Assembly symmetry: C4
Homo-oligomer: 260 residues x 4
C-alpha cells in the first residue's frame, strides 16, 4: 500500500513538458509558459557558465600553446553542470532545451511543432544575449568567454568538432528524454554529462560553441564577430541532423522490440 500523502511522489512522472503538448497547446498561456522556461533556464545556464569561464581564463598562461587540464575541467564543469541544473529546473516547464540545436532535433523528431520550436529558439537566443551582457557587466575585465579557434585547429576541423560534439548532445536528448521509459526522468543528468564531455573535446580547439545561442550572445556583447563565426551555426545544425538520422533509423527498425 501507498499512503495517500506519498502518492504524488510515486505517481507523478517527471517527464519533459513537450511530451504532453497536444490539443490545447496553442494557447497564449501555453506558449508563454514554454518561452518562460526556456528564458529562465537558458539565462541561468549561460550566465553561470560565462562567469565560470571568465574566472577560469584568469589562470596564468600556459607556455607554447599547451593545454591546461584543470582550466579545461573547470570550464567543462561550468557548462555541463550548469546545463544539468537548468534542465532539471525547467524540465516540466518547457522541457529544458536551452539550445537551438536541441530544439531543431526535437522539431525534426516531431516532438515539438515547428512554430513552438521557433518561439523557443528565438527565446534561447535572446536569453544568451542577456546572459552575455549580464556576465560582462558583473565581472571585471574584458569578456573572456567568447568562442574562438585555438590549439592549431583550422576552420574545417573546428566545424567537424562542433558537429560531432553537438551530435552527442542531441542523441542523448533523443534516446533518454524523447523515448519514454523508466530513465526518462534522469535525462537531465545524462544531458549534462554529454555537454561536459563535448566541452572537454572542443574548448581547446573551438572554444566549444555547441549551441548557437551560446556563441552569438558574447559576440554581440564584445561587438566582435570572427569571419568564421558561421562554424558555430552550421556545426551544431549538422550535429542535430546527424543525431536525428541515427534516432530515426532506430525508430524505423523498432529497436526496442525483438519481435515486432
Amino acid at each position: 500500500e501507498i499512503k495517500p500523502e506519498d502518492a504524488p511522489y510515486i505517481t507523478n512522472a517527471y517527464k519533459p513538458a513537450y511530451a504532453r503538448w497536444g490539443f490545447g497547446s496553442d494557447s497564449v498561456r501555453n506558449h508563454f509558459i514554454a518561452m518562460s522556461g526556456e528564458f529562465v533556464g537558458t539565462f541561468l545556464f549561460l550566465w553561470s557558465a560565462f562567469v565560470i569561464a571568465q574566472i577560469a581564463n584568469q589562470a596564468p598562461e600556459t607556455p607554447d600553446g599547451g593545454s591546461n587540464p584543470a582550466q579545461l575541467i573547470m570550464i567543462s564543469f561550468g557548462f555541463g553542470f550548469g546545463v544539468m541544473v537548468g534542465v532539471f529546473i525547467t524540465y516540466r516547464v518547457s522541457g529544458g532545451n536551452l539550445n537551438p540545436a536541441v530544439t531543431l532535433a526535437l522539431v525534426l523528431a516531431r516532438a515539438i511543432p515547428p512554430f513552438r520550436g521557433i518561439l523557443m529558439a528565438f527565446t534561447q537566443i535572446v536569453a544568451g544575449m542577456a546572459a552575455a551582457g549580464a556576465a560582462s557587466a558583473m565581472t571585471p575585465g574584458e569578456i573572456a568567454f567568447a568562442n574562438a579557434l585555438g590549439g592549431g585547429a583550422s576552420r574545417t576541423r573546428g566545424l567537424f568538432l562542433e558537429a560531432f560534439g553537438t551530435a552527442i548532445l542531441c542523441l542523448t536528448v533523443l534516446m533518454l528524454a524523447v523515448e519514454k521509459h523508466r530513465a526518462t526522468w534522469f535525462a537531465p543528468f545524462v544531458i549534462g554529462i554529454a555537454l561536459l564531455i563535448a566541452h572537454l573535446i572542443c574548448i581547446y580547439y573551438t572554444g566549444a560553441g555547441l549551441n548557437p545561442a551560446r556563441s552569438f550572445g558574447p559576440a554581440v556583447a564584445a561587438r566582435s564577430f570572427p569571419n568564421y563565426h558561421w562554424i558555430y551555426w552550421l556545426g551544431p545544425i549538422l550535429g542535430a541532423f546527424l543525431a536525428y538520422s541515427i534516432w530515426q533509423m532506430w525508430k524505423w527498425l523498432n529497436y526496442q522490440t525483438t519481435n515486432p
Copy 2:
C-alpha cells in the same frame, strides 16, 4: 508482486520532512526534531567545507592575482558535495535546508510556517558558529575560510553575484524538493550541484557566501567583520526572493498542466 520484505523500499517515499508537517507539528517534540536535523546537517556540511577550504588555501599563491582552477574546484567540491551529504542525511528529519536563505524561500512558498522557519534559521546560524570554531581549533594556522571580496570585484558586483548564485540554489530547491513528483527524492543531488556551480561562480570574487550562516560563523571566530559584510546577508535574501518570484509565477500559470 512485491514481496513483503521489499515493500518498504518501494512504498516509503523519500520526501522532505516539511511536506508532512501539518496538524500536530507544533509539539515540542516536532520542533526539536526539526532543530536537531538542521543542527546536525548544518554542522557537518559547514565543518567539512571549512576544513577543505582551509587546506585548499594552503596552495602556493598564484601570481598577479590570477585564478587557480584546481583550488577553486576543490573548494567547490567541499561545499557542493558537503551540502549533498548533509541534505541526504537530514531530508526526512528536517528537510535539509542548512541555509537561512533556503528556509526563507520555503517560508515565502508556504512550505514551512514562519515560526518553525525562524527556529530553523537560528539553529543554522548557531551551527555555523560551532562549525567555524571547531574547524579553527582542529586545523593549524589562522582561519582561511572567511568570506572576502577578491578578483577585482566591487561591493556592488559582489552583491549581485551573491544574489544570482543564491537564486539558482533556491530555485532548485523549489522545483525539485517542494514540487511533488518522481524526482523529488533526488533533489539533494541537484541541490549539491547547484551549490557546486554557485561556488565556481562566486569563490574568486566574493569567497562564496550564499548562506548567511556560512558567512557569519567564520567572522565571529576570526573576530573580524569587513564593513561590506552586509552583502552576505542582503545578497542571499534577494536571491531567495527572486527564486520565489519565478516559482510563484509558474504556480500561478499552472505550469505542469496543458489544459487546466
Copy 3:
C-alpha cells in the same frame, strides 16, 4: 492511480537489450540492430575519449617522469564519462557493451550467445579503428592517444594492472546490468565510474587499454605496434574471466537469497 500519459515512464523498464534476446533474435534485422548500437556507441565513446586524450597530452611535460594529476583526471573523465554516455544511449539498442572484453564476460555468463557476441566484438573493433582515424584527422599533430607502458612499469606489471582494472569493469557489468533488480537501469552510471577508476589506476603505467578495440585502433592509425601489444589483449581477457568466475561463484551460492 497512474494517469495513462504517465504510464510508459513508470512501466517501461530501462533494461539492456540482451535481456530480451530470445526466440526470434537470429533475424538479420535483430543482428543489424545490435551491430548498429555497438558501432554508434563505440565510435562516439572512443572518438570522444581519443580527442580528449589528445588535448590532455598537450599539457607541459612533468619533470623527472612524475605524474600530473590534473592531466590524469582529464583523460579519466574522457573515458569514464564517455563510456557512460555511450552505454546510456545504446542500452536498449545493443546493451552498450562497447568493449570486446565486456562482450566476452557476457558470453561466458550466457547473457549473449556466441555468434551474436562475435558479431558485436568485430563491430567494436572496426568502430575503434574508425574512431582512431577520425580523431587523428580531426586534431593537429601526431597521434597522442595510443597505449604505451610508462611510469617505470614492466610488461608483467602492466599485464596485471590491465587484468585487474578490466575485472573491476566486467564485475560491475555483471552485478548491475545482468542481474535483474531495481538498480539495473542505473548500471550505465556505475559502469562509467568503474572505467573512470580503472583509468586512474592504469593511464600512468600502461596508458589504460582495458578494451582491445581501444588499444588496436590507434595502433593501426599510427602504424605502430609495440612488441608488448599483446598485454592489451591478454590482460583484458584475463580480467573478463576473473570477473566471470566471481559472479559464477555467487550465482552457484544463490547469493541473493538467505534460505534457498
Copy 4:
C-alpha cells in the same frame, strides 16, 4: 500493466544483504557468502585506491609544505569512487561494508549481529593486507600509500579529524542504507560521496585512514608502524559511536512521523 519480462526490474529491491539476514542466516553457506562479499569488495576498493594514491604521490613536491589540490582530488576520487563501485557490486552479497568502523556502527544499530560482524571485520582486515601487498608488488617504487600525519597536524587534531570524518561516513550508511525507503538503493552513491569529502578533509593532515583495514594493511606491508598508529583505530571507532548516537536519538524520537 507491467509486462512479465520487466517485472524483476521493477519489483526486486536493490537492498543491502543485511536487511534480509534473519532466521536461517547462521549457516556456513550464509557466513561464507557475507565473507566473500566483504573480501572481494574490500580488496577491489582498497587495491584500486592504493594504486591511485601511489601514482598521485609521484607528483612533483609542493614547496613549503603547501597543499596540491589536484593531487588531493585525485586521491579522493580513488577512495570515494572506489568505495562506490565496491559497495554497488557487493550490496546484495554482503551489504558492502568494506570498513570495520562501518560494521561496528551496524552492530551497534542491531542491523548485523555481533558474530557475523566480527567475521566481516576480520575479513576486511585480511583483504586490506592482501590489497596492500598486491598494490606494493604491482607498482614500482616504495610504498607511498601508508597513512602519516602531515600539514602541521598534531596527534590530537588528527584523532578528531579521523573521528568526525568517520562519523560522516557512518551516519550516511545509517540514514540511507539501514533506514528503509525509496532512496535505500542509492545509498552506495551517497556513501562514496561521503568518503570523497572525508578524504578532502583528512588526506593533508592524517593521510585519511577512516577505516582500520585501510590503515593497517600498508603498515604491515611497509613493516612500519608509527607510534601514533592508534589514532587510525580509535578515531574511526569514536566516529562510529558518534554516528550511532545521532541515529539512535532520531529513532527514539520517531523522526519520520509527525504524529506517532
